[PDB]
Design a protein around this ligand. Structure first.
Ligand SMILES: Nc1nc2c(ncn2[C@H]2C[C@H](O)[C@@H](COP(=O)(O)O)O2)c(=O)[nH]1
Length: 70
């Protein structure tokens, strides 16, 4: 009995992360098009899944990177 039960059904960013987890991508660089909510979504999901999540840059250069190494 292990996994995620609190499913969002189908989530854009959660779909991006689940692909990322099984992909060659050691780090998933998201576009600056993500707003606070979009990032919050990613931070939440990555935190629950167990991956490293951080936003780098500034604001006009602010992007979020998810890493498989956590
Ligand atoms: N759960 C969680 N949320 C985070 C973390 N860091 C930032 N957030 C949230 C706070 C903000 O509402 C949202 C996006 O804002 P930003 O900190 O600019 O990425 O992400 C974190 O480490 N864990």
């Amino acid at each position: 009995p292990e996994g995620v039960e609190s499913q969002d059904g189908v989530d854009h960013f959660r779909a991006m992360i689940v692909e990322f987890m099984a992909s060659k991508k050691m780090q998933l660089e998201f576009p600056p098009s993500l707003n606070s909510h979009d990032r919050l979504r990613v931070h939440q999901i990555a935190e629950e899944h167990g991956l490293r999540h951080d936003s780098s840059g500034e604001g006009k250069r602010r992007f979020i990177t998810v890493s498989k190494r956590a």
